[PDB]
A paper describes a structure:
EBNA1 is the viral encoded DNA binding protein essential for the stable maintenance of the EBV circular genome (referred to as episome) during latent infection. EBNA1 binds with high affinity to viral origin of plasmid replication (OriP) to drive latent cycle DNA replication and genome segregation required to maintain stable episome copy number in proliferating cells. EBNA1 is consistently expressed in all EBV-associated tumors, and is thought to provide a survival function in addition to the maintenance of the viral genome. EBNA1 interacts with numerous host proteins important for DNA replication, episome maintenance, and host survival.
To investigate the potential role of amino-acid polymorphisms in the EBNA1 DNA binding domain that may confer NPC risk, we isolated viral DNA from primary EBV positive NPC in patients from Hong Kong. The EBNA1 DBD was amplified by high-fidelity PCR from the HKNPC6-7 variant 2, subcloned, and sequenced. Several polymorphisms were identified that conform to the high-risk forms found in other NPC derived viral strains, including M81 and C666-1. These include 10 amino acid substitutions most of which were considered conservative, but several potential variations that could alter function, including T585I and T502N. We then solved the X-ray crystal structures of NPC and B95-8 EBNA1 DBDs, as well as their co-crystal structures in complex with a cognate DNA binding site derived from EBV OriP. The structures reveal an overall near-identical fold (RMDS of .219 Å) between NPC and B95-8 EBNA1 DBDs. None of the polymorphic amino acids make direct contact with DNA or altered the DNA binding interface. Amino acids A487V, T585I, T502N, D499E, and R594K are on the exposed EBNA1 surface opposite the DNA binding interface, suggesting that they may alter potential interactions of EBNA1 with other proteins. Amino acids T524I, I528V, and L533I are buried within the protein surface and have no apparent effect on overall structure. The NPC- and B95-8 EBNA1 DBDs were next assayed for DNA binding using BIACORE surface plasmon resonance (SPR) assay with two different DNA probes derived from either a single FR site or the paired DS 3+4 binding sites. Both proteins bound with high affinity (16-17 nM for FR, and 11-14 nM for DS 3+4), although NPC-EBNA1 had a slightly reduced affinity for DS 3+4 relative to B95-8 EBNA1 (14.1 vs 11.9 nM).
Residue numbers in the entry:
A (entry chain B): 459 to 607
B (entry chain A): 461 to 607
The structure:
Amino acid sequence: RKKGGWFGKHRGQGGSNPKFENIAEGLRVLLARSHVERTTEEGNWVAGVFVYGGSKTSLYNLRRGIALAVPQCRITPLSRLPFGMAPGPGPQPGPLRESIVCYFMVFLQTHIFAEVLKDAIKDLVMIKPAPTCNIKVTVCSFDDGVDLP
Amino acid sequence: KGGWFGKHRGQGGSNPKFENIAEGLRVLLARSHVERTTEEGNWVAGVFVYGGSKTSLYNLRRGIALAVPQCRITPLSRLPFGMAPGPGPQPGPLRESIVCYFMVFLQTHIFAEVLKDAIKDLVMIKPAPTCNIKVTVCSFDDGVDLP
DNA sequence: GGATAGCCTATGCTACCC
DNA sequence: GGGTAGCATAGGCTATCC
């Protein structure tokens, strides 16, 4: 029985469906309690949200969800994390060595909404079963902003 | 002519090309012997590098790894679009461009600043596309728990 | 809503060209 | 040291499973 190959939707062209819509609605409810400004007139991307861990699929679905809930943001594809510190006095891994742990980046126009978005993702995720509850989120601040093309 | 050389993702070593870029960086980083590590060892800061071209970004990445053993670096990935100009609707948050980026993780913000300065100065005397590479210092409120 | 199959195509990697 | 070729294997995407 089926199970897909090519569906004519390229990188970044993801549509919607109940699964991603339901995730988005979870975010929207939380976000609606904090009705803060998500845009500025200048429109620069001065803040971000760095999301990682859990599992590839759970991260992916979260990314798809955020996208539907927040048209005012911009989101990278999933990518991978390098390793952290090795314990003890020994040698460390090279800076390029990559792990199995994924991450994605959300860009935002206001610092205020970045904080709220971060809170919402945490709360959305903290009550769900593993691996989704293990998804970590941190606000990310850009000194000079980012010139998204 | 190359195909498979046995080197998987993240395993890249060194050669004259990358070491040359690394030495350029080392000289510049030597302008400011600030602390690059903490006792706690948390990844609280970074630099966000993007633009130029795929290859010039890539080569920079390789060079930084050789010049800065104390950092950790993502693979290259892609940027989503910004604001669309004028009358049209905005692109979806997921739509991706051709512009690449990578992230460097650091344990101190003070060195992030120096690393950024180093990259800008390293790149501004070069021709396009490399001179068009953009850098910003990056700060993680709650840090990043790199595996 | 997480995990997977399976086409498309992205990057990581190296050595070659110049 | 920028652009490339070309294997390996990342992810984006979907429907199907359950």
